Amino acid sequence: SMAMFYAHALGGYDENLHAFPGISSTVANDVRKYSVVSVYNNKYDIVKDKYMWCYSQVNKRYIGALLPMFECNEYLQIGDPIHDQEGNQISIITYRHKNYYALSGIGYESLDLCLEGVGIHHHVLETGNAVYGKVQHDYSTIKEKAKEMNALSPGPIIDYHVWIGDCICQVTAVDVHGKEIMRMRFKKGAVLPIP
Amino acid sequence: SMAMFYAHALGGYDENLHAFPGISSTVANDVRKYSVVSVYNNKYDIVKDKYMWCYSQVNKRYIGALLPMFECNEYLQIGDPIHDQEGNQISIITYRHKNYYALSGIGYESLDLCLEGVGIHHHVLETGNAVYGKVQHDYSTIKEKAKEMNALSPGPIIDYHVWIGDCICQVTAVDVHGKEIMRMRFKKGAVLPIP
Numbered sequence: 045s046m047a048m049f050y051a052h053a054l055g056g057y058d059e060n061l062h063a064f065p066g067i068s069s070t071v072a073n074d075v076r077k078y079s080v081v082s083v084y085n086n087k088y089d090i091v092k093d094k095y096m097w098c099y100s101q102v103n104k105r106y107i108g109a110l111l112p113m114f115e116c117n118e119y120l121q122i123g124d125p126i127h128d129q130e131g132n133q134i135s136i137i138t139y140r141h142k143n144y145y146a147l148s149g150i151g152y153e154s155l156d157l158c159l160e161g162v163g164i165h166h167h168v169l170e171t172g173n174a175v176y177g178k179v180q181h182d183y184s185t186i187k188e189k190a191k192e193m194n195a196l197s198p199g200p201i202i203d204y205h206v207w208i209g210d211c212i213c214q215v216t217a218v219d220v221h222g223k224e225i226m227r228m229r230f231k232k233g234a235v236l237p238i239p
Numbered sequence: 240s241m242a243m244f245y246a247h248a249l250g251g252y253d254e255n256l257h258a259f260p261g262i263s264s265t266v267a268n269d270v271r272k273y274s275v276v277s278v279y280n281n282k283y284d285i286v287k288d289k290y291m292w293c294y295s296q297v298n299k300r301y302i303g304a305l306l307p308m309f310e311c312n313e314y315l316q317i318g319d320p321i322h323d324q325e326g327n328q329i330s331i332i333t334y335r336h337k338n339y340y341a342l343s344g345i346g347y348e349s350l351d352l353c354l355e356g357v358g359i360h361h362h363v364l365e366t367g368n369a370v371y372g373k374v375q376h377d378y379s380t381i382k383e384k385a386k387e388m389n390a391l392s393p394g395p396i397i398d399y400h401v402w403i404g405d406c407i408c409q410v411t412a413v414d415v416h417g418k419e420i421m422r423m424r425f426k427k428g429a430v431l432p433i434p
């Protein structure tokens with residue numbers, strides 16, 4: 045049947061369709077392979093070695109991922125179809141960070157969460173800072189806190205924290221005492237969308 | 240260049256572009272002439288003798304008009320193109336009332352307002368009700384109300400009221416005491432959009 049793309053920001057979420065940041069679609073496009081995309085007969089270049097952390101929270105389901113992004117100085121509307129050079133539609137306009145536009149679909153490192161009972165928060169990780177739990181600081185302070193919190197018994201996860209830095213991205217999970225229960229690292233630099 | 244359509248609901252109002260209910264566009268399409276439209280390669284019939292009163296409030300400027308509307312049980316997303324039989328985009332999805340979708344552009348009777356210092360309010364005119372000023376009731380109550388308010392000295396207009404009924408549409412303008420200062424009547428039946 046027809047390849048549909050519904051934007052989550054317009055209420056288009058369908059659990060029976062493939063779900064990506066800001067997109068429910070009938071087909072699952074791998075957008076990692078493209079270096080140039082087109083929007084209304086206009087070609088744009090995919091940014092190399094810099095990505096955009098994009099997420100959408102629908103019902104109690106978090107859908108986050110590191111996505112490719114292309115630069116475009118003109119204003120492009122949410123829902124605008126994105127094509128490849130062969131005429132195929134591969135995505136729609138979703139998220140934006142100044143002159144950068146995310147390319148949503150099957151991308152790079154991703155995170156999916158049941159948000160029932162837990163929260164999630166997003167931070168810009170300042171360069172040079174380490175991360176423990178729900179805080180970011182210099183290595184010495186983070187290191188000493190990790191040893192301090194080490195003597196505590198782990199409680200249940202209550203919050204997730206996403207840290208988006210220019211060279212690394214990390215996700216931590218904390219209990220009620222701020223103790224780090226879990227930590228993932230994505231070895232990519234990225235930016236967050238500007239609403 | 241290429242014919243562009245921007246949905247007002249997505250922040251795409253441009254005062255230098257043609258402005259219609261929910262649409263800023265580089266072209267001004269007269270949509271009264273169409274009896275069928277197509278969305279996602281599906282043909283839909285324009286309803287005959289019933290319209291939709293659509294409006295958007297952008298830049299303290301009110302833009303309202305009776306628009307043609309077509310019946311579609313499927314879900315169509317705001318901003319998606321509307322085509323004619325020849326494949327040309329003539330409009331975008333804007334407003335909806337259950338299984339009816341507006342066809343915005345140059346439509347039928349219209350109302351433009353400068354919304355600074357004056358208000359506007361929309362009402363469904365219940366069948367059999369009469370209207371005075373900012374209120375609707377049965378004809379007996381309205382007759383008495385009109386007599387009472389006749390004795391009042393008129394003041395400057397501060398509010399507009401749009402009455403959309405199955406047989407007729409009317410706009411009244413009231414002063415601070417609710418006296419009717421102006422009334423226009425459109426000899427068409429219509430419905431209001433449902434968000």
Ligand SMILES: Nc1nc(=O)c2ncn([C@@H]3O[C@@H]4CO[P@](=O)(S)O[C@H]5[C@@H](O)[C@H](n6cnc7c(N)ncnc76)O[C@@H]5CO[P@@](=O)(S)O[C@@H]3[C@@H]4O)c2[nH]1
Nearest residue numbers: 173174175176183186187190191193194212214224227229
């Ligand atoms: N190992 C590792 N793998 C990578 O892939 C990686 N990428 C970048 N870096 C950075 O290199 C520096 C040295 O790492 P490290 O010395 S092992 O210190 C880590 C951790 O051991 C410490 N910590 C957490 N929990 C406990 C606990 N229960 N007890 C004791 N210590 C704990 O908290 C610190 C968090 O710092 P961060 O990870 S955000 O940045 C790192 C540091 O700045 C990486 N490090």
